[PDB]
Each structure stands twice: as structure tokens, then as C-alpha cells.
């Protein structure tokens, strides 16, 4: 039904907003102030967007997040691909629109995710993994219909999880936690240096999060039947 | 019924508070610290006011927001006009009372919305549009009775949306997102320079937000009948 | 019943905690950082305490707040007096315990509420009034059983209202918004300079808040009968 | 049942995350900025983890917290021991993994809890006590099934309680409030100087919190029967 294309649209616009506001708030340099401010910006961007379209598409706005739900057998392979496609175009569009209204000199590299001189790509990949792992873990747990009438706003919980990822990570890798968010700055600045970290960390972290939740913490046992039936629809 | 004049009163007092506390917290200069602090101040002012009178008038406290609900066919043309009238007088009053208790030298221009030297009015109008667009989008989505038992506090969601608007926007336009909030400082400092941006951006953004929500994301299909019936009451 | 002395105890301990953590976090000087940090500290102290004992005593932890509920005919004159008595002793105790574990040199004046050199006591009284007014207004609205299933945490709403009061007020009067919180530092440092502001502003603001809510925004019409019956119990 | 080993696992992973992100965000020095940022990091780490596994193990992720529930007769002596065991190994593991991905020079002492030169261990023990006391008090009150449909997110309430503990405490003792969180940095840096404070304060504070709640504020009267029956299972 049209109850599918609306979601794809939700994922496109939300991703454009997420990157537009996220990157926009990161322009400049610096420091606690800097980190604190950028951590809150991305976090509140997500909390806002999750309230805005979480009921419509589940507000993934993140390829690694969508990948998590795929292996978690909660969405079809067809939906996953489109979500990720919409997320990549949306992100690029947000970065594009951001570039068009931002004064040069302040533009910098459009907040491209970058490693710290003293951090190896190996350590950086492990950082991005842990960041995305606690992040996806919070998403799965709070989206789980099987629990709590005392959750409060799941939109904010997830947003603050993203903020926590930044408060810690920015010092190491600028905190990617999202392939699409990393990709947009890279494709427009023509700089794919160390970009592998920002696809690998999240995907693996997202993978370990889903697995850890569904197959150990609070098992959601699906029969091989449904798995394929879902991965198909 | 009197269940109409109470709301107008709600919109008047809330607007006076919103501008009084919002502007008051913006006095001085500066920087992350500055932005972070002012972003939170406006955001918590709104979250507070939305809890205070959201059940009474819907706590629009913003002309562009009210305009959004008009074209969204959720209020009558009569209510909209009064809301906006109450919002403009309330704002001016808040700025007035703020001026009366604030020491000169610190008064400055009473936190008048201003463009960054390197930002054209065109880019500034597009910024204000995006700010108000994600803002109204969050308002519509969270006010929508058709969704979530997991929303948490809608008052805070909207407040944090406003904070996000500031964390990004202040650097560009000081972040208006509200004609009344921009107007009060302008009418009292007799400075309407670039004021057009602060009416145009929000109104258009507010317009694109409502349209985007009601006519694409989660369509609320009203028959031409009701539209006029509502725009009339 | 004992369902009265538990509340008095709740108000005593909560007040000791409120002042202990509130003042403790204010030691030193400074600036956004300073204000932001102290605003959040008092705010989260209250949100925490309101969750801790709001169901037991309503968590007034504030004489001006209790006064608001008295004139609002929601508590007896007997309860009000005891609450305020417990709040004053609790506060002093918190400041006392704070003094005993804090290193001198850092102690300063134990975060005594103070006016800004350029702010007259008249302007300062009007500031404290507005601060306490939006504060009590938020308390009444969020405690009102007659509304919202979308309030979220009222504990946090009120806490953030207090934070907003500080983000704006600290620059003017250090932000009292609470006679007991102002009193404790004064009685122990033997400095009652301008102390009148910190009793007068809140009480009046608290008074205007209750009146504004119960007699105009969302009238809670009590017959003269009940008023006295309540003011008596 | 397996509805016991999942919880132990929950407590292990959550503790590893808590310390990994908590310590990681504390690396460096400094100041409001520093404190504010670290306070929020620990706070949001907990709020996140409480949402992630609070429904599975109650998300104690803290020996002093678990001890509180033991004397509160809410868990068996067998569960308590395992929880604390899982919490200690989890913490050490988190600090270990943190060390492996963090650049030296920035590693410092891995955010080891430390006293301020001007603070005696006696004053420091009293500080840690008060910090953990308001903390446990908030936990008990918000976990209490006997109250509120207006609590909002208990995960966030507790998290913000932890943040408040840091906003005040870091200046004194770096804010331990958690034996496991203090232990991990100590065992790996081979520095147990003043470590006694970080086990004694929390345990006593946690003890006074439970007692204060269950035996005075909102008594949860258990017959000697059940007490032992529970302490046994």
C-alpha cells in the first residue's frame, strides 16, 4: 500500500534534516563546549525526527540502524534497500542545502568524520563499533513492544543515546554512528580518506547490538519460517 | 463560549513570558557557551509554556505556528487572527517589562534577530525556513491525536525542537523561528533592518511543514466541506 | 493520620537535599558555563526530589510554592505552616552539612542570593516575581489532575522551569525563587542584606501565579464553603 | 529459570558500557565545561542503560545500588552477589577495552576517582554518602510500583540524579557513587589510594537511602517472614 512510500519519504526528509542540522551545528572547530553543543545538536535532531516520523517509518534515518532491523528480521530486504537508498540521497541533499546557505570560510569540510592523529584506524573502528552498539541496543530495547509503560519518550531516549555517543566519540572519530551522515560530507568534499571506518564500525556495531539483544538479553525467537517470510514479506 | 477568551489570554501571557525569558537570557554577547545557553533558554521557555497552557489554547505563542494551523484547517480564521494579535501584544509587553527591569549597558538591542555579515538575506531566509519547517513538523506530529502512547512529553519535544533550531541557527540569523519574538525587539529599538527575513522565513517554513505533514507524510484528509466549515467555525 | 507526618518529613529531607546540592554546585564564581551548570543543578535537584517525594507531600520544598497552594485553597493553614517550618529547618540543615564538608576558600558566602550592582532592589523584586510566577504557573498547570495524558514527567517539567528561572535570573539576583533556599545562606553567613527581595519577589510571584491560573486561565471554582473548609481541613 | 542468567548478563554488559563510556568521556582535565560534560555523559549513559536492560535485570549496574536492594529485601543474597560480581568484571572489562582503543597521553589515570587536596577523607566520605543517598532515594521512589502514572521516564530520572551527583561532587571526589566504577580504574592503574572512600561512602549512602525510603517516607512493611524468604528466594 501507500503505507510504504510514505515511509520511504519519511526516511528521505528525516535524513536530509538530520544531516542538515547535524552538520550545520558542527561547523567551526574546538573543547567541552564544542563537543557538548554538537552532541546535543545531533541528539535533539534525532529525538525530534523520531517524534516526527517514528510512527510512520520507524525513523531509522541511518543505514547501520536499518541494517540492524534487517538481520533482526523486522523488515523486508526490499524495504531495507529503499530505506538506505532514501537515507543516502536525503543525507547528500541535506549537506547540499547546507552548503548552499552557509558562508564559505565557515564551511570547512562540512563536518566530515575524521580520525584523531593518535588513533589508529583499528582503534577507530572499534570506537565506532561500541558507539553504534550501545546506540542500536537502546533502539531495539525501546522499540520493543513487549516492554514498559514507564519508558517515557523513546524518541528522547534514542536521541540521548546518540548524544552520549558523541560526548565520548567526537574526540576519537568525530563520532559517525551513521554511514549516511558520514557519506554526505565525503561525497561532496571528494574526500574518502579513512571512510571505511565510518561504514564498518556502525554496521558491525549495529550487528552486534541486534544479535546481543534478540539472541541473548531478551530473545525474540522467530522460526526460520518467519525469518525468510519477513526477509521477503 | 468563555472557552475562547481564556485561550486568547493564554496566548497573550505565554507570549509575554516566552519573549521576556527568551530575550532576557540572550542579553550580552558571544561561542558555544552562549549559543548552548540561549538555545536551552528558549527551548525550556517553550516546553514550560506548552505544559502551562497547551491544554488551554494549544500554546501556539507564535504567529508562524498559528498560521500553520490555519492552512492546516485546524482553527478558524477568527481564532488565528486573535491568537496572532494576542501574541504580538504579549511579545511587545514581555520585551517592555524586560527593558524596565534590565540595567542599561546590558540591554543592548534587546536580543534583536540579526543576520551574520557573511550571510545574504536570501540564505538567511532559507535558514529561517528550514528552522521553522522542522519545528512545525515536530509540532504537528506530536499534537496529532492519531498517534503514540509512547510520545512522552510533547511539551519537551517541541521545546527541544526549538533548542535545536537555535543551536544551528543563531550563528546565521540569531534564530527567529517566530515573527512575534522578532517583532518585539524591532518595534522597541526602532530597527526594522532585514526584519523581512524574520516574517518570511517562518511563515514559509511553517507553511511547508504543515503541507508536508498533512498532505504527504501522514495525510489528514479533510473534505472541502469541513475546510471552509473550519476556516469559519 | 501518619499520612501527614511522613509528608512533613518529606519536605524536611527534600529541602535539605535541595539546598545542599543546589548551593554546593554554586560554589566558586563566574559566565555561560557557570550559569548553565548551576541552572541545571538546581533544576535537576528539584526534578529528582519531585520524583522522590512528590507523591508523598507534593514536594513543595519551597515556602513561596506552599504559600501558592494555601491561597489556592489546596492545603490547610496547619499543613502550610508545618511545610514551611520543615522547609526552613531542612534548608538550614542542608547548608550546615554543606559547610561541614566543604573546604574553606571555596565556601565563599555559601551561594547567598545577591543583587547585581546595576540592578535596583525594585527591579530585583520584579525579577524574582516573574521568575517565581512562571515557576508556580508551571507547577499548578502540571499538578492539575484535570489535564493531559501527554504531560510526560511533571517532575522534569517543574525542574526545567526552575532551570529556566536561573538561566535568566542569576545575572540579576542570583535567582532565589525560594525563600528557604535564600534564607539558609543568609542565616549562616549573618548577612541579611537585600534579603527582603528574596521573600517578597517569590511570595508575590507565587501569589500572581496561583491567582492567574485558578482565577482566569483554567478556573478551579471553589465555593466559599470549601475554601474555609479546606483552609481548616 | 534462564530468567536469571539473562539478568546477570544484562548487569555485566551494562556495567562494561557504563564504565567504558563514563571513563572515556572523562579523559583529559579541567571547569564548568568539563564537569557539565562529564556529568551529562555518566547521566545519559545510565539513562540509556536503564532503558536498555531495566526491564531485564532492573539495571543496577552498581554494587552500592544492588546492596540497597538487598537490605531493602527486594532481591536474594544469591542474586545480589552475582550482580555485584558481574558488575565488577563488567566494569574492569569496560575500562580494559577503553584502554585498548585510547591513545596514551590522553589515557591519564583512566578517570580514577580522586579527592581534592583540600578535602579530608572524612569530608570526602560524607560527600560520597550524600551523593549516593539522593541517588538511591530517587531509584527506590521511581522503581516503586505503588506510585505515579505521571513519572515519565524513570530511566532519565535516575540518569539525571546521577548527573546531579556529578555536577556537585566531581569537585570534591570526582564523584564515585559506584564502587565498580571506582574499582575498575584503580585495579588497572594499580592505585588504591583513598579507594576506601569510594566503597564506604556509596554503601553507607545507599544504605541510608533504602532505610529512609522503606522505613520512614513510604514504608513498605515486610514481615520478618518474607524478609528471610526473600533474602533466600
UniProtKB/Swiss-Prot annotation, chains A, B, C, D:
Major component of lens fiber junctions. GO terms for cellular component: anchoring junction; apical plasma membrane; plasma membrane. It is a multi-pass membrane protein. It catalyses: H2O(in) = H2O(out). Keywords: Cell junction, Cell membrane, Eye lens protein, Lipoprotein, Membrane, Phosphoprotein, Repeat, Transmembrane, Transmembrane helix, Transport. It holds the Pfam family MIP. Signal peptide: none annotated. Residues 56-71, 173-187 dip into the membrane without crossing it. The chain crosses the membrane at residues 5-24, 36-53, 77-100, 122-142, 151-169, 195-216. Residues 25-35, 101-121, 170-172, 188-194 are extracellular. Residues 54-55, 72-76, 143-150 are cytoplasmic. A motif (NPA 1) lies at residues 62-64. It comes from the Eukaryota. Changing residue 221 to A: Strongly reduced CALM binding. A motif (NPA 2) lies at residues 178-180. The keyword Protease does not apply. Changing residue 143 to S: Slightly decreases water permeability, but has a minor effect on the regulation by cytoplasmic calcium levels. GO terms for biological process: gap junction-mediated intercellular transport; homotypic cell-cell adhesion; lens development in camera-type eye; maintenance of lens transparency; visual perception; water transport. It is found in: Cell membrane; Cell junction. Belongs to the MIP/aquaporin (TC 1.A.8) family. Aquaporins contain two tandem repeats each containing three membrane-spanning domains and a pore-forming loop with the signature motif Asn-Pro-Ala (NPA). Homotetramer; each monomer provides an independent water pore. Two homotetramers on opposing membranes can dimerize, forming a cell-cell junction. Interacts with CALM; the calcium-calmodulin/CALM complex interacts with the cytoplasmic domains of two aquaporins, leading to channel closure. Interacts with BFSP1 (via C-terminus); prevents calcium-dependent inhibition of the water channel activity. PANTHER family: AQUAPORIN TRANSPORTER, LENS FIBER MAJOR INTRINSIC PROTEIN. This is Lens fiber major intrinsic protein. It comes from Bos taurus (Bovine).
